[PDB]
Amino acid sequence: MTSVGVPIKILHEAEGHMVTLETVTGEVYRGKLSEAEDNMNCQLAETVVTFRDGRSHQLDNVFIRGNKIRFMILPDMLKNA
Amino acid sequence: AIRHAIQERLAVTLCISKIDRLLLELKLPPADAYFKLRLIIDQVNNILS
Amino acid sequence: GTGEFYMDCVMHDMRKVFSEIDIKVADPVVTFNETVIETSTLKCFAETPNKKNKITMMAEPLEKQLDEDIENEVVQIGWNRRRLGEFFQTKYNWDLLAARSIWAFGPDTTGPNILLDDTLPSEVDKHLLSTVRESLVQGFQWATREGPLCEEPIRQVKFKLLDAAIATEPLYRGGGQMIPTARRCAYSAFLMATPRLMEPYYTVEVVAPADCVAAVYTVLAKRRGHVTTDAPMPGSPMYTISAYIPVMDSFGFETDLRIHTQGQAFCMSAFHHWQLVPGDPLDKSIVIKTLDVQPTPHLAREFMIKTRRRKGLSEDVSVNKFFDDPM
Amino acid sequence: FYLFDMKSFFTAKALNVAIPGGPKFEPLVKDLHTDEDWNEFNDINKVIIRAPIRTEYRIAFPFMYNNLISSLPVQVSWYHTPSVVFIKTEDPDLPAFYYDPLINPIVLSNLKATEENLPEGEEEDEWELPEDVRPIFEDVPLYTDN
Amino acid sequence: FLDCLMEQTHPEFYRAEDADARFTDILFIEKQRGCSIKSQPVSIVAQD
RNA sequence: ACUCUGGUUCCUCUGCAUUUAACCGUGAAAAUCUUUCGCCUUUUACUAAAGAUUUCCGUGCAAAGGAGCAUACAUUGAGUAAAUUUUUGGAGUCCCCUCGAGAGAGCGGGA
Ligand SMILES: Nc1nc2c(ncn2[C@@H]2O[C@H](COP(=O)(O)OP(=O)(O)OP(=O)(O)O)[C@@H](O)[C@H]2O)c(=O)[nH]1
Incomplete structure (x- = not known):
């Protein structure tokens, strides 16, 4: 690929693993990042959604638009990458 | 190798290798070098099918 | 080792x-x-040491592909009743009433020989025959591994069983009496069936063009090999030859x-067929001397005799004792 | 070079056998003529000589054929090199890349041609390559007189 | 071909200009014969 | 923004060229010790092979210093310079209910 910035490269290395991301509406999604994009659209699988009141539900697949993601907690091994 | 890999139920992929032999040794032009590569792929698919 | x-x-x-x-x-x-090349011209009987039981078998030469299928495990004996019967009719358009009979392969569960039960059910009940069955299968398996001409493994033989004399004895008769008796039955069945040796064969792949084709044929002709492929290897100046x-x-x-x-050619060798050594292992008219060439008929006899000598067996076959006086 | 490089002559020396047209040496172990006793292993009633296993096979393989190979410094020749098929061209006016008639034609008559999943016409034919995208060496000639 | 995967991941991996290094042909019989004679495994991290 | 240096060539010194499958040498000598065949009224000089060791003709790279020929400041090791949906050109403010002195929060409601 073209030289996209290091945070986007680390996001694609995060595809193997579990990531936890919060959306601008406040819901926290934990799941296994199956595809990511350079606009940081995220596809999660085996997802658990946690609502802002602390309720939770399972979701088989979730697509989140990249500009609606606030942050992602990435796994630690990516610090080595 | 292909046949035994199928029987194992491996997943089979092809890599055509020492392509340089076409230009340097055989000196096939560009067009005939494509046909030689095409025939190799056909041979393997003939085994697979 | 491979080669x-x-x-x-x-x-x-x-x-x-x-x-x-x-x-x-x-x-x-x-x-x-x-290997046998004929159907046994007699049905051959063996009586147990105690004379209370009688077993009769004939040997036959196996359906030509089927030993590859067994040794590959394209068919497996654990599939016995439904799936094994279906396999034999669908591939071979076969015996299927008798294919349901088969229940054993030898000298092991992947071995290239089959034992059938061909007793018509009027002669013995399936429970009594089931008791001896495990004994007879061990006998047939022993006979196919160790037994006949030069104590090499039997291959490509099909055995049929068809006899009923089984008595009130089961503990005494079942182990001791029957299993050695089934081996003598398989030998005498095998030995009546006109027996032959098989040797294993390579397939060869060779690559060099104009002069080397003639050289390949020459070197093969010295070594009993024969050719069949003549390919002008596409987009290459080499020809590709293949030979057995x-x-x-x-x-x-x-x-x-x-x-x-x-060095213009090179060859690699791989194995897949068994083929029958020319001549007759049992032909007493052939006398073998190691100082001289022993070409077409003598090949089978030399291979048997020198194999027996290497193993350390008696120089010539038992067959008079295995048929015995009654048969 | 196959039976005639370096390693074959080294092995030939250690085995104490000649190669036709190669060098020969003093025996490396002078005892071996004294050992000869014929009977017990060697007996030849037991073994099937289909062809004479004589010199060249003992030099090519060593360890499959020779006894005593632990005092003897047998060395192993390079097995094979894939034959270079360069055909010299004698007409200097030919193109540098050309289909030499000694090269067999690229055809196998029975061979089923693979399905090519090319893109289907109607939308995909409109697709166009940007006007400055160009083969990497477009105007460099495929070959020169060098 | 595996020597190329070695050369990319390693940097220190010397390949001669004359002859193949054949890193996965570790045995000395394989060095002398130069055919590969036994399998050998590699494990490497590589980018798509 | 900082110290850092002219190219090229040549001489001489210093270091390393043991993980040998293999190779400082795509070439190829001689000697010593130990051991095994053949010449000999004696010893060397020898024949032709092994193992252990040296000598000799060469060798590679790096670094350092110097000396000569034609002459130029940049530049190495250390580091700069795009308002129309997914970021870098506002879907933002205000006005009620809740907890609380206080100021924030509730997929809160609304203009
Ligand atoms: N001309 C040419 N020769 C190549 C090329 N790649 C490898 N070879 C040659 O082919 C020979 C074998 O290469 P290897 O890597 O040992 O091939 P290999 O298949 O791994 O050997 P094995 O696995 O034991 O069969 C060597 O002489 C290589 O120089 C190539 O790209 N061009």
Whole structure:
């Protein structure tokens, strides 16, 4: 690929693993990042959604638009990458 | 190798290798070098099918 | 070992890596297999040492592909009633009333020989026959591994069983009496069926163009090999030849070919067929002397006699004792 | 070179056998003529000589054929090199890349041609390559007189 | 071909200009014969 | 923004060229010790092979210093310079209910 910035490269290395991301509406999604994009659209699988009141539900697949993601907690091994 | 890999139920992929032999040794032009590569792929698919 | 280069490398590691001692190496040799080429012209009976039981078997030569299928495990004996019956009719358009009978392969569960029960059910009940069945199968398996001409494995023989004399004895008769008796039955069945040796064969792939084709045919003709492929290898100046050659003759072949070609050719060898050694192992008119060439009929007899001598057996076959006086 | 390089002559020396047209040496172990006793292993009633296992095979393989290979410094020749098929061209006016008639034609008559999943016409034919995208060496000639 | 995967991941991996390094042909019989004679495994991290 | 240096060539010094499958040498000598064949009214000088060691004709790279020929400041090791949906050109403010002195929060409601 073209030289996209290091945070986007680390996001694609995060595809193997579990990531936890919060959306601008406040819901926290934990799941296994199956595809990511350079606009940081995220596809999660085996997802658990946690609502802002602390309720939770399972979701088989979730697509989140990249500009609606606030942050992602990435796994630690990516610090080595 | 292909046949035994199928029987194992491996997943089979092809890599055509020492392509340089076409230009340097055989000196096939560009067009005939494509046909030689095409025939190799056909041979393997003939085994697979 | 596979062929030539495997045994060189194995023996290199033996000398250099692992053993580091003064080993003597015999000249290389193939294991043979023993096969029938006819249906047994008699049904051959064997009576147990106690005379209370009688077994009768005939040997037949196996359906031509089926030993590859068994040794590959395209068919497996655990599939016995439904799936094994279906396999034999669908592939072979076959015996299927008798294919349901089969219940055993020998000399092991992947061995290239089959035992059938062909007793018509009026003669003995299936429970009594089921009691002896496990005993007879061990007898048939023993006979196919060790037994006949030169004590090489039997291959490509189908045995049929058809006898009923079984008595009130079951503990005493079942182990001791029946199982040695089933082996003599299989031998006498096998020995009536006109027996032959099989040797194993290589397939060869060779690449060099104008002069080397003629050299390939020459070197094969010296070593009983025969050719059938003549390919003008597409987009290459080489021709590709393929040939069958018998492993017992192959040992020089790679070095002979590269010398006579001057390295222009190279050949690799792979194995897949068993084929029948020319001649008759039992022909007493052939006398073998090691100082001289022993070409077409003598080949089977030499291979048997020298194999017996190597094993250390008696020089000529038991067959008068295995048929015995009654048969 | 196959039975005639370096390693074959080294092995030939250690084995104490000649190669036709190669060098010969003093025996490396002078005892071996004294050992000869014929009967017990060697007996030849037992073994099936289909062809004479004579010199060249003992030099090519060593360890499959030779006794005593632990005092003897047998060495292993390079097995094979894939034959270079360069055909010299004698007409200097030919193109540098050309289909030499000694090269067999690229055809196998029975061979089923693989399915090519090319893109289907109607939308995909409109697709166009940007006007400055160009083969990497477009105007460099495929070959020169060098 | 595996020597190329070695050369990319390693940097220190010397390949001669004359002859193949054949890193996965570790045995000395394989060095001398130069055919590969036994399998050998590699494990490497590599990018798509 | 900082110290850092002219190219090229040549000489001489210093270091390393043991993980040998293999090779400082795509070439190829001689000697010593130990051991095994053949010449000999004696010893050397020898024949032709092995193992252990040296000598000799060469060798590679790096670094350092110097000396000569034609002459130029940049530049190495250390580091700069795009308002129309997914970021870098506002879907933002205000006005009620809740907890609380206080100021924030509730997929809160609304203009
Ligand atoms: N001309 C040409 N020769 C190549 C090329 N790649 C490898 N070879 C040659 O082919 C020979 C074998 O290469 P290897 O890597 O040992 O091939 P290999 O298949 O791994 O050997 P094995 O696995 O034991 O069969 C060597 O002489 C290589 O120089 C190539 O790209 N061009």
